Each structure stands twice: as structure tokens, then as C-alpha cells.
Design a binder for these strands. Sequence first.
RNA 1: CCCGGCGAGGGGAGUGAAAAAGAACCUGAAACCGUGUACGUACAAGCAGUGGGAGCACGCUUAGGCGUGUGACUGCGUACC
RNA 2: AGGACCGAACCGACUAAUGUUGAAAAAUUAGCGGAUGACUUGUGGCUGGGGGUGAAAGGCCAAUCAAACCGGGAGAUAGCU
RNA 3: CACAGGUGGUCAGGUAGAGAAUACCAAGGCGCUUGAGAGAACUCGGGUGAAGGAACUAGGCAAAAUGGUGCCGUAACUUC
RNA 4: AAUUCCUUGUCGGGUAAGUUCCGACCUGCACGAAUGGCGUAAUGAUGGCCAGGCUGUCUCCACCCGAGACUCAGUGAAAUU
RNA 5: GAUGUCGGCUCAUCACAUCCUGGGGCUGAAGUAGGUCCCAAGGGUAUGGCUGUUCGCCAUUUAAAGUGGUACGCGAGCUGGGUUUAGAACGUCGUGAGACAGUUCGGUCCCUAUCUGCCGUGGGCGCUGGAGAACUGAGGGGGGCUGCUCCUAGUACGAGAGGACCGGAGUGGACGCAUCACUGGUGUUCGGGUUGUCAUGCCAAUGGCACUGCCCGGUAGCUAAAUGCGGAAGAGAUAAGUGCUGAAAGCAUCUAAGCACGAAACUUGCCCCGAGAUGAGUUCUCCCUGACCCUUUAAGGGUCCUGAAGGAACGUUGAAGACGACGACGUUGAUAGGCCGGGUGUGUAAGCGCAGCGAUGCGUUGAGCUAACCGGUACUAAUGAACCGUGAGGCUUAACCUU
Lengths: 114, 123, 209, 56, 71, 127
Amino acid sequence: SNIIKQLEQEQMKQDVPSFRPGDTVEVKVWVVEGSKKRLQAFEGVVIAIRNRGLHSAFTVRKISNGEGVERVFQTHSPVVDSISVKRRGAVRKAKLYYLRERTGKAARIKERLN
Amino acid sequence: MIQEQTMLNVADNSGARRVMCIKVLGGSHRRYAGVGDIIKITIKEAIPRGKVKKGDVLKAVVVRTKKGVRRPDGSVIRFDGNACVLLNNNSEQPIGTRIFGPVTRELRSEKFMKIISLAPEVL
Amino acid sequence: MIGLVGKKVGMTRIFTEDGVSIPVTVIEVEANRVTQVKDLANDGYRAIQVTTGAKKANRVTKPEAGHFAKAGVEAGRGLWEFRLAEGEEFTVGQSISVELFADVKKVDVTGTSKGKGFAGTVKRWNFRTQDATHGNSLSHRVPGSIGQNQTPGKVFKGKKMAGQMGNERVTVQSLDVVRVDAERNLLLVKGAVPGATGSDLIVKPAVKA
Amino acid sequence: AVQQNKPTRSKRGMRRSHDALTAVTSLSVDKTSGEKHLRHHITADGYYRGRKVIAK
Amino acid sequence: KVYYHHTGHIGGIKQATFEEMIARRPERVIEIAVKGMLPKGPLGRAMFRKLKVYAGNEHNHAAQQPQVLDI
Amino acid sequence: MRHRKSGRQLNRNSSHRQAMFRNMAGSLVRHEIIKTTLPKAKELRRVVEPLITLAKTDSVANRRLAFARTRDNEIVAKLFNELGPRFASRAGGYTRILKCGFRAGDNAPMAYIELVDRSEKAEAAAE
RNA sequence: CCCGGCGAGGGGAGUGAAAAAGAACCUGAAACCGUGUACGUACAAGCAGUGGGAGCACGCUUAGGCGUGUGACUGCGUACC
RNA sequence: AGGACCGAACCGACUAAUGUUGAAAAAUUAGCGGAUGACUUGUGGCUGGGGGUGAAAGGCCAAUCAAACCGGGAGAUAGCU
RNA sequence: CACAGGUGGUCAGGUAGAGAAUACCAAGGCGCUUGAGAGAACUCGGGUGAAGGAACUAGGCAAAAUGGUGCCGUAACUUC
RNA sequence: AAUUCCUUGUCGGGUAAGUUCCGACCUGCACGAAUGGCGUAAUGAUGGCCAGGCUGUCUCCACCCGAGACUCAGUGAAAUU
RNA sequence: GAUGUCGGCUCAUCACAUCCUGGGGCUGAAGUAGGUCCCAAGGGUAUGGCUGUUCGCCAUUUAAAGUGGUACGCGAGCUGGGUUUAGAACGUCGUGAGACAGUUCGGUCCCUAUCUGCCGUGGGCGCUGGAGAACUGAGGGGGGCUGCUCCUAGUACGAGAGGACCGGAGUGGACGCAUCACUGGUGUUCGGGUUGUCAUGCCAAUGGCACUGCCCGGUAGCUAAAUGCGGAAGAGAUAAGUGCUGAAAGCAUCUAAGCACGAAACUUGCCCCGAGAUGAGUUCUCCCUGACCCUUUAAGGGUCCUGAAGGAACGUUGAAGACGACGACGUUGAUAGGCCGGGUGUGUAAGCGCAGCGAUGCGUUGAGCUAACCGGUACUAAUGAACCGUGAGGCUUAACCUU
């Protein structure tokens, strides 16, 4: 029918801020738990492009302190609380790997600016 | 882990350096572990002031997989390495009081209130 | 009870309010258009003939066309039939669609099977692949001796060997309806549909006790 | 492998019975010429449904 | 008397009740009773194909006029 | 098996396949009219048309862009100047396959490929 | 003289007693593969034979129940050195 | 300087992947050692079968080696098949 | 055998690179003749791999990583 | 121990483990001083074991590409019998 | 004149004399627990080490770690790791050659399937006029395993501690099927990056070639390591077993007549193949209603006119597959390629201005370029035919047709 490959675009949220890989961001999320609601954030650099209709996620890599850890927060999830853009940078590459082990002043790549 | 042998990282003040998976628990005719899984470790090193000594065999649960770990959205927390928190060998909950390095957010349950209230990550 | 002939159309990792996602397969509900509504007036046969689709029908045979004439007069895509229970059927205008799954919690799902080319030696049967070493004579891959010896002196039936898929049915059995959607016309089922996407399926209320 | 005994000549014609060349069910001529055709391909002079194509 | 066969699968002899062969397809109990009484392959296949039993008290040879026989 | 796919693999490895297409799309601009095997004519069709689309209207900067994607000197000299005003009156089907028949040397099914408005043509035979 | 590259190969026509002596030419088996015809092969089964046999083609069987060849089918039945 | 090294050409073949009615009467590709030395190596000559020739394996003697090839005794012998 | 085999003398162009390795390339050779299409098992060749790290196997074996120049830094043993 | 009738000796060690391997011991095969012995640097494509960089050998196998198979076209074997 | 092995990978299958659940009897068994235990082939029955190891030892999982056979399964499947004294040589023995059931080092192993099977698949014929569509079940297999705790239930029972089972429930484990959105794999028909040389006259910019040069991201497809998920309520015929009424022996008793209950096996239900089932099938939809000569005639032969419904070759081709078949589909056409809008990919093209020492980056532009997926578009190629199939289609008994 006319439904195939459209239903991904139809599901896809429209107030989500605009992006390129190397945009740093903050994912704000819940702890979930047994009955009590608290919040938490995760910040870093996003090393790679999303846009997957409903399945779209920020794969932020954190790299602030300690050994590297990559986190995937799916955007379209109701427990994902808030999204500041902060810096929106350019890289002309698909992967950021040389910063995996260095976490000190590593997740703060520039705003592309005027 | 997924294979036979597998050294992986100490996650507690219990030991040093590396400690060895001898088996997976929570079924048989298994070679390989799921995401939510309980591992069997021998301490392959130890530390003199740790809870345990070289070649003592105890129970454990996953905190990092180098592949990545998932449950709630199916989204992965993807790591630099495999690492494991020892449990009590029969009586559950961790034996060590500190986690060393980052944690998942797939560990967020009543039987793990011990390990997630720690400060290095997911508070 | 019958099926609703669907279309395989869509796959979604879907959210729920509680912070949980469900992997899902997404099905376009088309309406049943009846042909004749066969009942036990004629022979011992009791079953309802239903058409889910439409075709140009410039090449169709007149034997298919009188079939369609007696129907909802919509040049049907083709004929499927389903056995039925609890008395003779209601004969006019039936249009069976999303309402069928409102108290049907789990469905069976009968595909038109799985379309995996040859399938055949090793791949169909999840065998081991022969050793990559020892200079093995014209063998990096072999299924194994398929019998034994003279003692039976034959090859038994139902041993795992060769052949195509042959596109029979395959029932997965008892996978969950996650939601049904009027207006958008989606049946979201929790489990998978057989075949590549754009394939036909049956989605029928579950068979099992 | 090998074989037990020398096979029969009736066997050689039976094994070949399904692999043989099959009939064309007659032929085509043009709508538009006295030139004969090749069914559902085009002659060198373009004749199929008249016009002209491919004058090589 | 459990009408023994082994078509090609699963350890065991496989079987069929005395009760099926009259309750379902009721012809078969007589068919495979006279069968072993006939010579080799081919001529016993021509002997055999002359018997019909049908379902029972519903025979279709009304028009031939059958001569009744008590045994 | 090959479900939900498109296009065709012809005769050899990828390093050969790109190098063969540079010969074959260049021959197109040099002979204007060709005959080949029918799989071979589709890949020939599918190579040339997207270049034509870019080239459908004249632009020196887009001619520099076209030299970036397809680095041949023959194609970038024909495109924009010559071939641009030619195909301006179409949106796809700048060229057509005429199913000329089977190959004489063996039996492979062939198609002839012919630019859409081709009416001036060479009068020698081809095989 | 026909087909054909200008080829290969055969044929017709003509030559001789003879080419049913055509050039690798003497007459010519048997393996060998293929054609033409008859009868046969889809209730169909193993040394393929033996014993019994519907049928049909051909033979004016003086028609006087036959000859010729094959044979549905089937009782019986384990090669030779 | 070097019976030193890593390493081509140039000589080999510890192992590995393949070849096994092969592409080929050990070749192909890759790891590996010798490569100024007790080396590699052209030309021309020479020893002849239980005899040569061997840093020795009962090695090597015409893509052949725990017994070369040919012409003769010789129709060896046959308690055997 | 148009053998993917074997074979001595002489010569020595460009860039990058320990160098006559080696990537491309001037002079020069040359398309090692089944073809085209498909892209089944399977065979051989060719490319790749999550997590693991020999757990494969008799055996860490073409697997695969390593390799060059510059620099800091450098063990027991030793005929230095 | 390359050496051991028994035997995979006893115990420590790496080890998830340990017939082998290494260290110690004798409760010692027929060990044992030029078919030499203790001990040793460098050396050998040398043997046994281990962790790591690293790896499809494998756990557990998936897909992609080409030459045969296979499709379409040509020619056209062999072990056997 | 050939039945040819250990050890190790692959692949199994049959006998139940059952490792186990499941129904039940005994107990010096109260219940728990142990001992005793019949029925029963249906089904599940783990992995690393050392060694060439069957067997050994050791570490470990799970409720669990079976019994017997197979040229002591399986080189017309795999390998010499072993036998290894083709071969040195250590240890040992003999004057020695040579040997060793002591030992260590690497080490050549064939076969394209005749008939036969097994799985998959087509052709040919027949179903009685033909054709196209759904379809029934004569027959024959899949699943059949098995743990957990929660209720049932601290209750009967026992001196007390303790303490029943079936049935409902969700869920693991083995086993098995399907799936590609998730998480990974690949994705030689998508974008980007990068070392080198060769090239586009030269510069800006850029590409061929080095395994797809190398390398990272990647759609749809396929795929497991990831994803979904059965293993059933019910029924009957029972088994062992508690009986009931009841004898030999005035009774008792599962037995002879008789009838209640009584297991995953058996007949099944749930699942799949299946009309050649020659007692060859039904129901729905479609079409064919002209003619003469001859002879043996439920008949065939010749011939005029004449062959529909339907088929197939042929054509582009597929969400189907070796070949085919199956399927979209041939201008009436969205089949395919192009092309447009959208999908999902990549990270802001080339050109122009500018900052900067220049490489380069950046505003112009949130760019350009783009594969398989969806809808549109006839832009482009699939002409008119011809051909297999024909003019209502067997005898005969009974029923109906003036019959």
C-alpha cells in the first residue's frame, strides 16, 4: 500500500532540535526506580548521526573522567525529560575515536558560529 | 562470558587487575551469556587486604560488556571492556562496597540498591 | 474462527508510557469482501470465502470473473477460504477488520512461508562447518554421513538434508497483539511475520488451548 | 564412485528425455511489411509495429 | 491385533487400534483380511480390486441387482 | 535467493566493474548508438541518465561538480554544451532499449540502446 | 547442374558389364549409434527365461480355425566359466 | 676482517593454506633460512650397478633408486595357481 | 603440450620508500583465447567481522597483529 | 631426564585444568664418567608449556565478490565394465 | 581375485532391559524423607584442561549428567595425531645383523553415484466433455521433554520439630520454528575520509590505480550472538491400580457376564504434507449447440467448414527460486529502468566571498549527492497474430424424461 517507509516518517517527532554529528548536547533522563521519581543528566559529544523515524537516539559518548563509556538514549522515549542543544559542531568524519581514552576537555567541540 | 576462559576486570575493592570467568550461571548447555546474566568467577589475582584470596571461586553479575548491555529501550551502554561485580556466593547482593569505573542503567533494581547508590556513575 | 488476510508492511521498536519499549511487526488491516458465504446447504462444507484486495483484471479468466461478479464486485486480487464454528454464517456486507482483535488477546499467525531461496545443505539445518585445516580433500564444508551401515541397510525418513523451503504455511503460534488502531488501521503484533516485507500473511485468532 | 554393470542403450535415451529441445508454437510476421519477424524482438529495419527504429 | 507398520520415523514399532479400522474407514478391516489370501503381487492386486465394502448399510450397487448371500 | 534488490553484477570483480563502466559510458558519448547484452544495456542505461539530469541545463560550476563525480574528459565535454539542450524536454527516459534479439556467436539475449530522439543514425550494421 | 568461402561433403545428370566397381574404389560380417515400419509399454514389480495367453499387422490360410512377427497379461521360476 | 646478522637478485624448502581422475609426473601463494661463504655457479672432462659417488639416509647414479638399461644363457626352474 | 616448471653472460630511467623489497611508472613488453548470464548447493580463489583469545587442534598454524626513520626508555644472563 | 619393568610414580607449580611440561623427592628401570659425564653464552625454519598486543582455528556462524558447478552456447574425457 | 583400526571433527539411527516427569500398589511408610515400584519409545539427556587416549584425573553447570546395538556406527565423509624401528638416535639386549608392546622429533591417505535410498523439484499420463477457482480427509509425520517458585497448604497428619498431592499461574532450561525493527554481522549497485604515484596543459578543485588500495559510517535483503515463541484445556480406548456385584472353597476378590474411576504411550484435539483415495472426489465460476464420404464400428479413418472457454512459447519482470514451477505483468500496462515528491544514508557539494602564514576552515547553504523501499509518471520497450485445445462428449442394470 502507501504505508511502507512512510510510517517511519509519520511516527517521527517534529519539535526535536536540529543536528549534525559533533553537536555536543545534554540528555536529561529519569532514574525510573520502584516508586520515586528523581532525575539525572548525561553530557558529552555525540559521535555519530541519528534520524531513524521513531527509533532515533543520541549516542552520546561521555568522556569527561574515567575510561570511556558510550550511552544511547532513544529520543522518542517518554522518560527522556529534556534536550538542550548547547554547541552544534562540524567534523566531516563519521567517528570520533581518538578521544575514547582522553576524557579531559574532550567532549566540548566548538559551535560552528558566524 | 561468551567463550570459555575470559579474563575480565575487577569491579570491587575485593581484588586486583583481572579475575577469571570459569562458567555462566542461570542455565546449561550454555557457552554464552545473555544481557541480564550472572557469571561464575575465580579470583585470578587477589589483594592482601581484600575480602578474598587467589583461587577462591565466587558468584558474580555483569556491569560492563565491551559489546554493550541493554534491557529497557533495548538501547546499549557500550563500554571499553568487560568487567564484573562479585556477588555473595549463595546469599545475593554485592560483597564489595565500591564500584570502580562507570555502571549500566539495566542494573536498576531492589537487589542492586547496594551498587547503584554509589557515586562514580548513574545516581 | 477465520483469519484476516493482512499485509507485511512495517517494523517498529515502539514505546509505552512506563519507559519500556516493545519490538513489534505492523500489519495493514484490509476489509473482507465475501464471494458466496458457503454453508452446509451444499455438501458437508461450511466455510467463508473472503477477498482482502483488488486487481486491474484485464488478463483474468472469465472463471475468476463470475466468482468476483457474485462477490462485492471489486475485481478481487484472488480467493482465500477459512473453516468456521458455532452455527451457519451471516451472508451480507460483513467487512471484517480491526474489531476482530478487541477481545482476541494473542494470535497464531499463518504466513505464506519464508522465501529463503535454496535453504538446503547446512544453512536450513544449522550444521557445523568442516575444519579449515589439515588440507581436507575437497572439503571446507560437509553435512556428515546420513546413515550408518548394512545393519538397517537403508536411509531413514525425516533426517535433515537438502531441499527448498517449498513455501507451505509455518505457524509461529500465540504471539501477543500489542495494540489495535482504528483510523490509522494498524494491527501491531509483538512477534514476527514470515517472508520478506510486502508479503501476504494470514493473521488468525489463536488456535491453542 | 564406479558402477556395477554396463548400462543399457534405452537408459541413455530415457535420461535425455526431459532435456530435449521444445517447440516454438509457430511464428510472427509484421503488421506493417512483407518482411518476416522474430517474435517479440525487432528486425534490422525496425518493423514490429511499423515506424522505424535502429537502422543499423 | 494392532495392524503394525514402520513408515520410516521415530524409535518404536508404530501401531493402529483394532477400534479405528471399524470405527473409521470401515471397509479396511475386511480389505486387509482377504488381502494376504491372494497370490504374490500383480494377480492378487487384480483379485483385490473386485471387492468393495463402502461405509456400511449405504451401498450404491442398487442398479446391478445384487444376489443376497447368507454365510 | 536475492529478495528486495536491484541492478546486475555482469562478468567480474568490482575493480573490473568500475573500469569496464568507464570504458562503456565513454563509448556511449563516442558512438552515440550501441548494441550489447540486455543486463549489460541496463547498467549502461542506469550509468548515463543521472549524469544527463545534472547536465540537463547548462552551468560551468555543475560541469566542475560533474567532473568530480565522473572524472572523464569525454563525458564532461559532451554533457552541458552538446547534450544539455538535447534532453531538456524530458524528465527520465533520455534513452530507450530496443530489444534487438539474441547473439549470433552463441545465444545471449541482447538489447540495442538508442538516445530517445535519435533519428540521425549511422547505417552500417552492428553485432 | 544444385547448396558452399573461393571451402568440406553429398546428390542429380552423364560414363561402364558392374559405381547395390566412385576413387580410403576388391565382396563384406559382428560390436557400435541412428532411421523407417509393425505390434507393445501409464493396477504399473526380481537373471528378463519358461509354461499358459487376449489382441493386432501382414499372408485371397481353396476361410476350413492355419502361416508369419510381436504381445496386454499372468502360473512357475535364482546367470555362464 | 668475519664459515656474524635482516634482506632482495640468486640458491634452498622448517611450517602454514590449497592441489589429490591438479593449471602442474611438489607446482602455487604466504611465513622461513643461506645471500661475500665450508657459498652461489657457467663451460669442458671423468668414475659404470652389490660398481661408482655420499658433511651417512643402506643417500644418488636420465621429471626413477634398499639393487640402472640392453643384448645373450633361456622355452631358467613350475612339488603352484 | 602455447606446461602457473627449469636455465648462464651484460646493461641500468622517474617519484615516494633502508635499497636492485616494495606502490605507481618513462623506454618496452603484453591481453597467457572458452564465452556471456546468473550470483543455487558445493569447490577453489578473494574480502569482512560482535564478544572472547587458542576456549580449535596432535600443535598459537597463510590465520591476524608486527615491520620503516626519528626520539625517550630498556632486564636476568653473557665468551661483553 | 630424551633414559622409569610398574606408570598417567609422589608432591609443589602454571593452571578454571595439567597423562605432557617445569621444580623438588626416591619409595632409583637394567642411570653413570669419550656409543662420555656435570655445567654454559651466542646459535637452530628444533621440541614442550604459558599470559598478553592480535587473530574466524574455534565457541557459533552470517553475509558479500570472482573463477568452475549451475544458465544459455560449443566441443567432449575417466576410474569402470 | 580384500568386511580396513585406535584417537579426534561431522552427521546420526534403531531395542527399552528407562537418567527423569507423568498415573498407581507396598513399606518394619503417619506426613515429610528414605526403602520398595509396576505401566510406559513419547521426549530432553552439558562443557574446558592435560594425553595420539577408549578408559583416567581435575574444575564446573543443571532437576538431570542414561542402558544396549550398528564391518566392536560413520576414509565409494573428514585427518595420519598414533601404530612411527621407510629414517635416525636416547634407553635397553646380543660377537653382530637386527629388535624393542621402554622413548622422543616432524611426517605423502584415492573414487565426478549405474541401479538403490533420502530431501527438494519438474516433465508425461489419468481422474470420462473440457476449463479456471476455492476445498474435504482415505492416509502419514511435527509438538509430545523438563525445572522453578506463587496459590493450593503450616491443613489432614505427628509425641514435637515438621508437614502432604493434584489442579490453576506466570516464567526459565533443553529442543524447534520464524523474524531483521532493536542489538550486532555483512551489505564489491549509498555518502564521507586518507597515505602514495600516475593523470585532468598549469593553479583552485578532482579522479584512475595499489585485494572493494586502506579505513569509518550504511538502506532494503539475508543472519545470530539479538528478536518473537510452542510444548494445550478437552475427549475417548485404556495401562498398572482402588473397587463394586460375583465363583472354584456358603466368604474374598479387577473378571467370566457386568459397570464407576484410572498416564505424556495408543485414537486424537493443537500443528503440517495430503484425491492415483483405480471405491481417481465434491462445491462454485466459465465455454463449446456446423457438415458429408467409408469401414472393422460404446470405434476409428478421410474431408470440407472450423476450434470457444482455457493453455503455453514468446516479453519486461517479482516482496518466488539451480532448472524450472509459483507470482506481478505485455500500451487496456506503475512490470522494469529513468524521473518527481517522500522514506531511510552521509554531514554541509562544486562554484563564490572571507579569515588565516598556507595547509585548511567558515558565511553563502543548514548544502550537495543517494542502492535495492513507497506512491506517482506511459518518459521508454514489451505489434497485429499464429499454434495445443473444437462444434454438448461410452456401454449396461435400476430411478426420471409421452419412455
